Design a protein around this ligand. Structure first.
Ligand SMILES: C[C@H](NC(=O)[C@H](CCCC[NH3+])NC(=O)C(F)(F)F)C(=O)Nc1ccc(C(F)(F)F)cc1
Length: 240
């Protein structure tokens, strides 16, 4: 996350780190949200390359044992039938991963709360972007989980020629754009947590940023709106 602060260990306990086996060890590639003891939600452009992946639930510092982490394998990857690699602007950036084993829930590992299908947020709704993503444009990954206050930008404003234009679809949530704070490479797939009904629900799956950089004035971070995929999410968990 660009322009972020460190989070406290118990802060966002449905946050996961998607890592791939990079020879001898494992490296962080993306975030995700734990949605079943055995299921994760991430972005489709993260699992595009056929690598060996692992999920780390209950992570905080990437580089240090925190004595709270659960390392689980991915036994099946389910990416949306319409994802097209080459067109992240089309939407459908969402994948579901069935984990090799069911995680143990505690104060550090908990399930992410999903919205009600069809829910659209008012402009400037309070949301937070979480992740291990670069802290500057062409920067390096954070060692600790970062959080940034990224309030939404509604779809009339975000598809303004001034902003992203027609690059953003109504199946996407836009948040930030102040040129200070944003999501960055390595945050992709991760949650956008918005306060609704005194509850934090994961309303985005971080999708992309501006090619000119991560924190650009009038370029907010774009998220896959979760509430548009509720009935696909359910149907996949149900048939597995
Ligand atoms: C450097 C930047 N990377 C990204 O935004 C990638 C998504 C990659 C899809 C490409 N296979 N994701 C992220 O970095 C995330 F952190 F922001 F979520 C970029 O490529 N973004 C980008 C690409 C295309 C368009 C579009 F085609 F829509 F015009 C918009 C943004």
């Amino acid at each position: 996350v660009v322009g972020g602060t460190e989070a406290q260990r118990n802060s966002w306990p449905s946050q996961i780190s998607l890592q791939y086996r990079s020879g001898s060890s494992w490296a962080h590639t993306c975030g995700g949200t734990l949605i079943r003891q055995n299921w994760v939600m991430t972005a489709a452009h993260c699992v595009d390359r056929e690598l060996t992946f692992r999920v780390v639930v209950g992570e905080h510092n990437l580089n240090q044992n925190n004595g709270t982490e659960q390392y689980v394998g991915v036994q099946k990857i389910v990416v949306h039938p319409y994802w097209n690699t080459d067109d992240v602007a089309a939407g459908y950036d969402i994948a579901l991963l069935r984990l090799a084993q069911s995680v143990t829930l505690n104060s550090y590992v908990q399930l992410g709360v999903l919205p009600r299908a069809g829910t659209i947020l008012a402009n400037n709704s309070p949301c937070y972007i979480t992740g291990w993503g670069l802290t500057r444009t062409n920067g390096q990954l954070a060692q600790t989980l970062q959080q940034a206050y990224l309030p939404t930008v509604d779809y009339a404003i975000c598809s303004s020629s001034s902003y992203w234009g027609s690059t953003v679809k109504n199946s996407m949530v836009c948040a930030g754009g102040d040129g200070v704070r944003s999501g960055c490479q390595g945050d992709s797939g991760g949650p956008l947590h918005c306060l609704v009904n005194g509850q934090y629900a994961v309303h985005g799956v971080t999708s992309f940023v501006s090619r000119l950089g991560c924190n650009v004035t009038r370029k907010p971070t774009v998220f896959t709106r979760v509430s548009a995929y509720i009935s696909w999410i359910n149907n996949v968990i149900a048939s597995n």
